[PDB]
Design an enzyme around this catalytic site. Structure first.
Site, PDB file in Angstrom:
ATOM      1  N   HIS B  40       0.807  -1.182   0.000  1.00  0.00           N
ATOM      2  CA  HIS B  40       0.000   0.000   0.000  1.00  0.00           C
ATOM      3  C   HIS B  40       0.843   1.234   0.000  1.00  0.00           C
ATOM      4  O   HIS B  40       0.307   2.307  -0.212  1.00  0.00           O
ATOM      5  CB  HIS B  40      -0.986   0.010   1.136  1.00  0.00           C
ATOM      6  N   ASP B  84       0.094  -7.465   1.516  1.00  0.00           N
ATOM      7  CA  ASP B  84       0.530  -6.091   1.585  1.00  0.00           C
ATOM      8  C   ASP B  84       2.033  -6.072   1.692  1.00  0.00           C
ATOM      9  O   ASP B  84       2.612  -5.827   2.738  1.00  0.00           O
ATOM     10  CB  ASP B  84      -0.106  -5.401   2.750  1.00  0.00           C
ATOM     11  N   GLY B 175       2.675   6.371   8.840  1.00  0.00           N
ATOM     12  CA  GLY B 175       4.014   6.694   8.517  1.00  0.00           C
ATOM     13  C   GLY B 175       4.933   5.571   8.821  1.00  0.00           C
ATOM     14  O   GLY B 175       6.043   5.557   8.346  1.00  0.00           O
ATOM     15  N   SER B 177       4.011   2.450   8.089  1.00  0.00           N
ATOM     16  CA  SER B 177       3.713   1.432   7.124  1.00  0.00           C
ATOM     17  C   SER B 177       4.901   1.091   6.318  1.00  0.00           C
ATOM     18  O   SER B 177       5.649   1.952   5.912  1.00  0.00           O
ATOM     19  CB  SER B 177       2.716   1.955   6.114  1.00  0.00           C
ATOM     20  N   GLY B 178       5.019  -0.167   6.013  1.00  0.00           N
ATOM     21  CA  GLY B 178       6.061  -0.615   5.184  1.00  0.00           C
ATOM     22  C   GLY B 178       7.287  -0.949   5.938  1.00  0.00           C
ATOM     23  O   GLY B 178       8.137  -1.637   5.416  1.00  0.00           O
TER      24      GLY B 178
END
Ligand SMILES: [Ca+2]
Lengths: 9, 223
Positions: B40, B84, B175, B177-178
């Site tokens: 995402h 994801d 922020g 994420s990932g």
């Protein structure tokens, strides 16, 4: 929501 | 990261910031040319910023390297957030050093209760927003599938796990994420989603990287 900037909810 | 702590500069040397003129997601360096992040987080114009601590100040140790490939998992579903995961190939290999280092992929999935380090430059507030300068860290346990599914009924796929603290106050947040969830030195998670951040009974949900190691390896090998 995803925890991205910006969130995807 | 809500309820975390300042990691300390470059103490999470695999943490990268994905930057598109601002930090928008984290990622994890898994080899000198590839970063794992969340699907995402995909966008054009990603500059991977490695070696960061204060993402708003050039402190030294940064390597900014453009993404040359951003490979969202082909089965990523942006509604369910299943799969994801995204691989970002850096345009050039990062120079690995003590401050820019890859994190190992899992060789097996992690068990509930394993403590992981989740890090990122995401919001540090569970209400409102405060985006930190420096990288924040949170030690957080992997929750059991049952608790995860209880917290997020019908939303947790086999490619997700929850980690964190049902009592609230400690979570990854926007922020983050990932970014990495590293447990026992393995990148077991990718910060993915959650209901709010650090909310009671709403732990963070993370992409379960161990389900993707082969995909990662195969995708890297073929790119
Ligand atoms: Ca910096």
């Amino acid at each position: 929501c995803t925890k991205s900037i910006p969130p995807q909810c | 990261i809500v309820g975390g702590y300042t990691c300390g500069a470059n103490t999470v040397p695999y943490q990268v910031s994905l930057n598109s003129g601002y930090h928008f997601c984290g990622g994890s360096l898994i080899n000198s040319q590839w970063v794992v992040s969340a699907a995402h987080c995909y966008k054009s114009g990603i500059q991977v910023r490695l070696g960061e601590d204060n993402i708003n100040v050039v402190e030294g140790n940064e390597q900014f390297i453009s993404a040359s490939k951003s490979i969202v998992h082909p089965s990523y579903n942006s509604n369910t957030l299943n799969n994801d995961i995204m691989l970002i190939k850096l345009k050039s290999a990062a120079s690995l050093n003590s401050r820019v280092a890859s994190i190992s992929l899992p060789t097996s999935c992690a068990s509930a209760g394993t403590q992981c380090l989740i890090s990122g430059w995401g919001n540090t507030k569970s209400s409102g927003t405060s985006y930190p300068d420096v990288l924040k860290c949170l030690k957080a346990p992997i929750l059991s599938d049952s608790s995860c599914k209880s917290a997020y009924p019908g939303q947790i796929t086999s490619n997700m796990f929850c980690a964190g603290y049902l009592e609230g106050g400690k979570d990854s947040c926007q922020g983050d994420s990932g970014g990495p969830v590293v447990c026992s030195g393995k990148l077991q998670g990718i910060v993915s989603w959650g209901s709010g951040c650090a909310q009671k009974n709403k732990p963070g949900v993370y992409t379960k990287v161990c389900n993707y190691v082969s995909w990662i390896k195969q995708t890297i090998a073929s790119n």
